């Protein structure tokens, strides 16, 4: 049960390369290009559910999300084969134009036998205790290794759990594994739709500095990671503002 | 290779060692002990339509690197909880969170308003015996009310000559006065682990 | 054979009277307890009431219906409902009975256990039939109906043991006696003037030699030669009560062996 | 209201074993075995038939509270005799005695022709 | 991890007899004899060890009982013929041939004697009924 | 709308909200609500 | 309401019986520094009373339960009361007792110097 | 009783006429409407669970209907016309347009606001739905809108109670207003804590329940339904209990009813002769066997049927706990009664016992942190509680003294604050000061 | 109210013996002890179930049914 202590920030598109150089100097590690297609599934509205669970406690309906790494051949628009895969690729991705259209994601979901590995994540609202200076969130995570059968498609599999597809988004970014086990992502976010792709992070990069801790009861480890995150905010202080986002934004539960 | 599953529904609690001494001259070596718990989830939707089953079977092999398979309407879900067998791409891009949780814990914690656990069949402290180009894995299954039956898992490295091995094990089981076992070799469609879990599902159902 | 010895004195449809010799007191008492409590039996476990215009309460009727003895010859072939993959009950783990009685007569209409009708599929087993012992052919009197009153309900019979509820007990009263002459002195007889005449001799005193009144107390003698009369409720034959009790005790001891061997290899 | 269900007098709950064996530090070569979901029926049988073993120095059982269907069985054996093997031999002899009793009851019941 | 000199001497003698066991079982398994490691006997009749070797072409539940005896000086091997059965997870010598036993020296066993033993053992098993 | 039974006539009557609570056959002003049509489960212990 | 014939006695209710019969200095001043009896002339017992022991154990356990530093080595002990009793056993509780004499004067007895005889 | 909708009603399943009976109770119709059951009673110190008027009652006999009883509780409700538009209505309320709905369920109600007979109910479930209109355009509790034209006046079930709706009775009162009566039926199965008495003043509760295989048993296989203690007999000198058990044993064997009228010429010796004629020890003793081990008990046990009565004091109607709950409007102390989730009286002489123990802080915690902890401000000049405190603005002021810098807060019981304000109403000044003025 | 199915003490089924007990009483003119012994109730635990039973159900049956079909 991973607790995710994270901070968030934003930069413009013009300050991207300066931030890459700055975090290369701070980390000592070069940026690594990464991508992940995240498909978010909501519970079936046609199914009458109970507010209670198998236990006598009340449970709200929560969207759950699957993620996997799309190969970068699907994200190059037949102009960047000569350019090597590094942090300079994200300079080109400015508009809504992404080679990953809706039909290729439907081909990925419907698997048109055995499926690619996925990562199912369930996240609740971050804690409301106003004594923590970082956004602390709980993520229930599992890895779908493979699938088979006549309904091996992950869409029908997720329909098997009672979950329907709501939306999906593609994020491409660069990340730094820094010192003391801190991961610093710097990502664009595109929403994939039938009407066309939409760049959510329009003309800017979403910044996420997170540390994953396995045990939520290790208060020493929690405080150590929080001090590391506040330290990183202190070196980045003045240049870029890192702050705890609103908990209402990180609430993935279905409202009604 | 290929696998088949024999589940003697009604055998004595000491049939496992009785079957072991039946294969006294065929065992080459004994590997590490293994175990498995079998779970069954019933869908708790108050208004379910037709053409959909309410039963989902969760099969967690403690061997094959701590892997859980979910079966519903002949559809599989190979799911892991170990940190070792995560693909490096899933942990590199941050889609994974370093260490995962078992899908049984997710279903019994964050999905209990849809699926509740009904039956748990913990076949623990099993043994692995190696025949001539074969691997029999004997275990005693246990529901809530004590003994349930003897579960035999057949595994071969190859698959060219496999049904003769199944016939030999069936003849050995008939030699120890057990005639009403429910064998199963049905595959899906096709991984080995998912097919083994499906064979467990057909073996444990009647 | 060498071991415990059985000599049956009287055998009946619902009674067996036997002498259990060459056996310890713990084994005989454990057999008595297992027969009382640990033998699986079929009994009505859940009653779904559709119509009840009788003068009896619904759960009054349900408690009466649970206590109706049902045939349990093939109760091994049934499964526990908690061990079954069905949602509530099915033919693999339960027997579904029904009861539809109506007061169409001017006089009072008695509702008997013979009016219970099996509607589930028995698949050729020998369970679920209510046990009839009296000469009239009616069963246990379940309810009484005046004119116009109706009772429509559905029973689900599930297997259980008498530890869960006494309705699953097939053993009635089990007589049990050892040393009818008090030669082991396990009782110190209360008396006013003479314990020999104030205490009536049991019927099992005829099967043992009376003490000679001059011989010393035998301190080495242990308790054997148990006089047991088992009475069957009717769900299973009384010899099957004894045999299934021995089998259940054997299964418990084998389970102890199984647990010890599993944690021995780990 | 507070009455427990009647099935966990004999059903193992989640995450509990039928037996658990703890070494007893008061006496050498002695263990204490806790039998879950049993009562006096098995305890008296095992204890009184363990005492027939010549290599068992101590055998006693107790149900500490009638509310909970469990008992603790303390076995102390002579040196070189593991009390686990004493329990195995005791249970095996009880199995053999019950099997002989069952077969004798079949023979004597089949001798009855008035039933 | 040997504390006393007597402990190290016992460990050395155990290493000697285990080396003899290993070289014999590698000899026979490289030949093709399905040597068994799942079988233990309380006593097979100094510190000694026993090998229960078999080749799966002569009658079931029979094995060639190889018993080695080891000391600081002199170490020989006993070639016994016996029938071992498994009953309820326990191995019992249902038959043993203690009469026609020969004790060959360790420094004389070769692959040729293994060939001779393989050609002899099936006849020896047949003659034991 | 909802089924009611008079106290002594035992005749099933349907009453709406605007109707006065009386028996159309007896005029007896005590009426009993009808038993529920749904099946009710009784654990036979 | 209720109507029970099992007579339950109404406790704390003697007012019925009450209404049935209704007719028939030199050494120390103010709060100066003089109030403290000095250590050399303390006249109270050197033994720590059962009430002093109970309140020191309670106060120390309340502090230990509120993340106070612990001046003894823990042997896997978890309960704050048992940690407090272990601190009291080897005299590592940094508290004092102000024993008020009836005239308002007091003696300061440290927990370290008090003898735990009970 | 089925056509009587009484407020409370207890009906045994299986009334038994007594084996030992008086000639007088024929005219009392006691053999026609009995009030107890002939239970096979052993007088034995079996396991120590029947000490000090406890009893051990057979769990297997309980399973077969021994002392099982029906319990009926009727709930009354009416709709009353206070004025013209302020009238109550039996209907099923909805959360959209009704204020202060109870958090229990309303799904079991019908369109008339009444639950149908036969429906199982649990604790704090609404069985009668009633709504009264309210004044529109108010602002209460925050969750107030113009949609809420009514408020909930529904009748829930008792929180500890549950059962089956047995009969629902719609009718009109004398005034013509419709009023309903709902009868809920439940069964009280005997358990540890239910009070049982013989016909001789020998009351007691079930200490424990044993099953049949753990009970002591005679050579005939008879086990008691009830084990009572021998120590209940000699100090109370209840010889008639023993004579009843002997006479009931004889009556049950002979198939008659024992004449247990007081001043007849019926002796213990005649009953003992009759009991000996039936093949039993004449004084009622039976050689019984220990149920755990099968061994003969060294003492022989007085054994036989005795008429026992199930008393109305069940433990489940008396068990009560409260961690926090509603407070009274006046004293702001925990309310009285387990029906209203009340608190337990920590009386004056309980306080005296804690004083004698020397537990000052526990006494303070009982009187303050467990009942009523009130923070009130006083000024240093006058000891009165007449300080206007604005904690959001951090402003304090006592008018008259006109001081804003000499304010103290104290923690007193709310009953103490009420006492002081009542004393100010009687023109008495209970001035509270935080510093001494005179020496000790 | 109506005859219990099983004896409370031992569990012998006595609910089927009630009408035969009444028949042995009123048309065979037997006394109650011989009637109980004729039905096979030899333990007084079983004898007191039928002997002391008051059968109140027909008193309940004299009232008209509340719901008449
Ligand atoms: Mg008292
Ligand atoms: Zn089923
Ligand atoms: Zn009418
Ligand atoms: Zn003032
Ligand atoms: Zn104010
Ligand atoms: Zn009886």
Numbering used by the authors:
A (entry chain e): 1 to 112, 159 to 302
B (entry chain f): 2 to 190, 194 to 210
C (entry chain C): 3 to 268
D (entry chain K): 1 to 115
E (entry chain l): 542 to 586, 620 to 703
F (entry chain L): 26 to 70
G (entry chain F): 12 to 35, 62 to 155
H (entry chain B): 785 to 1224
Question: What sentences appear in the manuscript?
Answer:
At gene promoters, RNA polymerase II (Pol II) assembles into a preinitiation complex (PIC) which includes the coactivator Mediator. Here, we describe the PIC-Mediator complex from yeast at unprecedented resolution and provide a reference structure for initiation complexes. Moreover, we observe three Mediator-bound fragments of the C-terminal domain (CTD) of Pol II which stabilize Mediator conformation within the PIC and significantly extend prior information from the human system. We reveal two stretches of the CTD bound between the Mediator head and middle modules, as well as one CTD stretch at the Mediator hook domain.
Here, we report the high-resolution structure of the yeast PIC-core Mediator complex that we could stabilize by addition of the +1 nucleosome. We therefore prepared a 16-subunit core Mediator complex (cMed) and bound it to a preassembled yeast PIC that was extended by a +1 nucleosome as recently reported. We obtained a stable PIC-cMed-nucleosome complex that was suited for structural analysis. Single-particle cryo-electron microscopy (cryo-EM) analysis led to reconstructions of the PIC-cMed complex lacking the nucleosome and the PIC-cMed-nucleosome complex at 3.0 Å and 3.6 Å resolution, respectively. In the nucleosome-containing PIC-cMed structure, the nucleosome was oriented as observed before in a PIC-nucleosome complex lacking cMed and did not contact Mediator.
